[PDB]
Design a protein around this ligand. Structure first.
Ligand SMILES: *[C@@H]1O[C@H](C)[C@@H](NC(C)=O)[C@H](O[C@H]2O[C@H](CO)[C@H](O)[C@H](O)[C@H]2O)[C@H]1NC(C)=O
Ligand SMILES: *[C@@H]1O[C@H](C)[C@@H](NC(C)=O)[C@H](O[C@H]2O[C@H](CO)[C@H](O)[C@H](O)[C@H]2O)[C@H]1NC(C)=O
Ligand SMILES: *[C@@H]1O[C@H](C)[C@@H](NC(C)=O)[C@H](O[C@H]2O[C@H](CO)[C@H](O)[C@H](O)[C@H]2O)[C@H]1NC(C)=O
Ligand SMILES: *[C@@H]1O[C@H](C)[C@@H](NC(C)=O)[C@H](O[C@H]2O[C@H](CO)[C@H](O)[C@H](O)[C@H]2O)[C@H]1NC(C)=O
Lengths: 156, 156, 103, 156
């Protein structure tokens, strides 16, 4: 008799295929989500640049002083980056992951804090007035798993 | 027999949870400690500005020419920034990390070196006279792990 | 700073090595750059209990080179010695990629 | 069997310790090399000042109108700054980095271009006549890796 040695194999054969794969396609997503964020990094100061030397958030790329077409600004897994009244929205590409990101959006949320500006990523938002921003709940919210933790920040 | 294959799992299960997490909450701390430092960067020249055009270190914010309330000047993980006779002290926020920083202080230490000023961060200090500064050992010393290495500089 | 840190406090880590520890590891000391790690007592039968491992760095045209294994200790910027103190965990135990003594 | 999971660790254990550390002690060097350059920035106009209102490059500090002792003019990682017939040489300190800079020199190279002066950093040089400058190859050449790229400019 050895079969229980075969049993235990077929217990090892049925693997978990750990959630540490899909929580880390969600954090592999955090990698290329970050690839969208690292794009946003450029616009942080450029959007800021318009905001400081013209006194309002730039509507759009042309005003921000970046590639007027957003799609030109893009990432290995990122589709485009649009300026939206200061709020920097980034759209993801299609396949490259299985994960529920494909074409989904990220936004980056600024706010003056006694001058000192405050950048929160995450849940898509959109600006309407100098400090007023709205939760831009359009169904392009990349899920909170995917997203950062420091930036898991909606419109406060 | 396979159990030693299960043994080795439960040896992998008991993970280290590397000190490269808490040495890098201490260097994640170095990130938002730097976020306090990047605030200080603004006051470097402004404090300097008072120091050069009035001939002594500014006591406080109002003299430095910055936000008279320190708390207004703040960071994502930073509470406030006070001018203290030139020495720029920065106080950290509460939670946002587990780490032993919460409400703790950093100081930035200036000194003329034949005109050329010398900025050392780190261990909290406080000025008393034009070049005399004291180790401001009040228990708000963020630990040296957290702190920089270039700026691991107390009052010499 | 241009030299290997003598010790933990300089390295910028837990000044007491013992604070830095593992489920089966006792402590971790910095020794002039060379990172020595001491194992705990029981938890295995095996001839590791209280034994040491070291990790061996070396600049290779800037690019640093990390070899684990046989306990070593640094004396100068690139000079390191085989720290043969009897705390050598046996080569069986050790890695194979890091089965590397002082070259 | 799991050992190949241990193998791959000890492949991760033997890390590269990327050349992006020593190419960035060479560009950390570019930071404090720049700290020497930022000193030179002051002398740019002051050396110029002598050059324009007396009609030749200042031999030395006293003529330039700066700290007569060069060592007084110094940086966190910089030893001294001497004027040498207009050419601003800067000497680095000892330890503070491992890197092959310790006590090494940088020079800054001026030249009139139809009035408009032309500042090139880098490979140590020394002036002999109003526009004649020599490659001051004394072994105090900080290596080109360390140095800038815009200023990787020897005597043309
Ligand atoms: C850039 O963003 C600022 C806020 C806009 N200005 C205003 C008052 O909303 C710019 O639009 C102005 O300039 C463009 C230039 O062709 C055009 O003349 C518009 O009529 C202006 O409002 C934005 N720039 C662009 C190119 O949209
Ligand atoms: C700013 O820092 C300088 C060093 C202070 N001057 C002296 C002589 O200590 C300023 O305080 C003076 O001006 C304020 C203005 O309301 C007040 O009149 C004080 O009596 C002066 O000493 C500092 N400025 C403030 C607003 O404290
Ligand atoms: C950390 O390691 C470096 C290499 C030491 N420096 C030298 C020149 O060996 C540090 O020791 C210096 O600083 C401590 C701070 O209290 C003390 O003042 C010593 O006299 C210095 O040599 C090492 N740091 C410590 C805390 O040992
Ligand atoms: C400053 O640099 C200029 C070019 C020198 N002048 C000449 C003609 O080379 C100055 O040296 C003159 O002034 C000093 C002042 O004590 C001294 O009298 C010399 O004999 C002059 O050549 C340079 N200044 C100094 C202080 O070397």
């Amino acid at each position: 008799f050895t079969l229980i040695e075969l049993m235990i194999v077929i217990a090892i054969v049925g693997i978990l295929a750990a959630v540490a794969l899909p929580a880390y396609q969600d954090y592999t997503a955090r990698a290329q989500v970050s690839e969208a964020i690292l794009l946003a990094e450029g616009q942080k100061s450029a959007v800021t640049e318009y905001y400081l030397n013209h006194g309002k958030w730039p509507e759009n790329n042309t005003s921000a002083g970046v590639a007027s077409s957003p799609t030109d600004i893009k990432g290995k897994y990122v589709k485009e980056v649009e300026v939206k009244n200061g709020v920097v929205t980034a759209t993801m590409l299609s396949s490259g992951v299985n994960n529920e990101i494909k074409g989904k959006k990220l936004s980056l949320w600024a706010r003056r804090e006694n001058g000192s500006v405050k950048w929160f990523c995450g849940q898509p938002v959109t600006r309407t007035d100098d400090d007023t921003v709205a939760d831009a709940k359009d169904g392009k919210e990349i899920d909170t798993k995917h997203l950062p933790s420091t930036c898991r920040d909606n419109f406060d």
